[PDB]
Amino acid sequence: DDVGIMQQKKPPTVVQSRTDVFNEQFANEALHPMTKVIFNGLDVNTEVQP
């Protein structure tokens, strides 16, 4: 129970469905625990407070 210093490991996250017509099929998918983000290239918080 403590905050790690060395960087960890990731799935890693992937973008998918956005537009107003999909027609997805659900082929493949791996079955391993992963992450899927809706918006492309987010993670915006560049402010650093010393």
């Binding site: 790690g4 060395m6 960087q7 960890q8």
Partner: peptide
């Protein structure tokens, strides 16, 4: 140092054939 990793080990087993000695023990 940079990235946290994981390693593995397995306890080893060492044995030779029973060697020959020329020195006696008891009377």
């Amino acid at each position: 140092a940079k990235i946290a990793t994981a390693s593995s080990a397995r306890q080893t087993d060492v044995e030779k054939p029973a060697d020959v000695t020329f020195t006696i023990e008891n009377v």
